Symmetry: C2
Amino acid sequence: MTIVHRRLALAIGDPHGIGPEIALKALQQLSATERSLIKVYGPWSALEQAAQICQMESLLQDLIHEEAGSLAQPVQCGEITPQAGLSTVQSATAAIRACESGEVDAVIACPHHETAIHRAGIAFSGYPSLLANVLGMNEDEVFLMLVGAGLRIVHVTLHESVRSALERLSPQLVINAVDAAVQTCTLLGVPKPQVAVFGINPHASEGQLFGLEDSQITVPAVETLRKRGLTVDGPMGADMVLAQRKHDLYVAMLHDQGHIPIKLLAPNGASALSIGGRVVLSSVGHGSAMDIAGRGVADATALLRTIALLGAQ
Amino acid sequence: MTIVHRRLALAIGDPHGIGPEIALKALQQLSATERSLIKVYGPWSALEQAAQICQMESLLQDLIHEEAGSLAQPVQCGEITPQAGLSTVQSATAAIRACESGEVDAVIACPHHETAIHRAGIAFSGYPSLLANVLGMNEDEVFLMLVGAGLRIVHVTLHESVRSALERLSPQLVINAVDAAVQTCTLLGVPKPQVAVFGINPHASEGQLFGLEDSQITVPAVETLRKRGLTVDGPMGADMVLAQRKHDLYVAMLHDQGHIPIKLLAPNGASALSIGGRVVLSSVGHGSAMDIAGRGVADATALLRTIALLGAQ
Ligand SMILES: O=C(O)c1cccc(O)c1
Ligand SMILES: [Cl-]
Ligand SMILES: [Zn+2]
Ligand SMILES: [Zn+2]
């Protein structure tokens, strides 16, 4: 059963966490062919460590690898350290640049630890942010798509107050989100997708009966996107459109509009794709699990699910 | 077998639609005891009509009834007429007032026809509205609870712009919604429920990192509600807490937060309860079906489901 149909970068995330271990356990389960399509970014010491523990030294031989986020000392499984924090960001940066340059077609990031990154003195507010800084983009120009249970929902705004999001919403910002998500849909195996744009207000403002925002923002944006020859319905009330379940891509205006349905239908296994330029980066949907790091009992399922997602045709 | 454990009003809705017929067909299936707990509001001519057609004249004898929304002419099954429109609103008003006065404990409305009501020169924007006008309350002092697929979600704000809702949100408004919903949960058969309060902002503001609103509004409200001895978790991010699926009552801050999950999980078989003062009003989940009125084609299932819901214990 082939699940990898294209070149991917895998940053092994925090080298003290379970990231290295799940990386090896996921790769272990693929064919030789599939494994050569995945290039692994991270400190080799960490991968050697996880090979001892999981007993997969044979696997290291055939791994395609680039040293990134090298360590100045032995690995300390379980420990939160600034060096591990830097390592994380360096690996992800190496991977992201490989995607930028075209060497790979998408990126997967194994789990980070935020405290670790913070103690390294690095500003980190999620992968959308990192992606922007590395690529030289405004954070506003990079979006998060959640994927889970058949649903794909790009969010035009994300981790800010509702008020702050409304102040920022514009025709252009929406257009940008759709363009980013459409490019991303090509990668996910849906070339020319059906798009539904959520209303900002209930019932998509109901004309102008429940606020003016939709006639100023979503409506103009949808008209501009149709004229450029995209199949776009909306704005329509998020509740009503979602329930029809007949679009390949929904476009949410606020974090909660897209996050509520996703976590309800796919409460464990939803993948979080940061999109910006040609670079699509997915986290695994779980933490660094410092408690069990080095103990060799971590599950690669979430990782494998993510590979399957970013690696279909 | 027994589904009616309490006194209820049933307004028969549009007397030209299927409302009268389903009223009779629902009552027909209950026991003598159950039938004496349901008082029917509406024109007697309409009930006589539907008795001829469905062949249930024997049933009219047993019925507890109050004439409301009398007609000036014979019933015209299938026809949209302003008289039928007025009749609808009068029956519902009679029913609501019987609930206000304490003669009954909750109210069910059989289907209306909006065009009919509009042509009578009456403003009708849903049952939340009507309930307010009749009881002498602002529309913001009536809350809407959606019920479907095990979820109960009262909304603190409803049919207004997101910004307008945030402007209006207060500790008191939330407390009010919960008090209304809790009283309503007693009626629904869940005396002492587990309550979850949604955050206004993503991740419930994340302390104050994503806006101040939750520390001003939801957090104080939850503390005040615990002090009065209610089991209340939150505020938590709506996405995360819903997915745990461990509470009898969720409290949404905005229309979409509560409407999205409900429509997704229960595209059919959901109930909309309007709560205000002691009055709990539910519609049946369907239209007046003018094309089949008088034709003996409609089932009472949706009506009976609603009776079962408002008549638990
Ligand atoms: O828009 C709503 O308030 C609503 C409430 C219940 C059912 C429905 O289809 C819509
Ligand atoms: Cl009675
Ligand atoms: Zn989030
Ligand atoms: Zn609505």
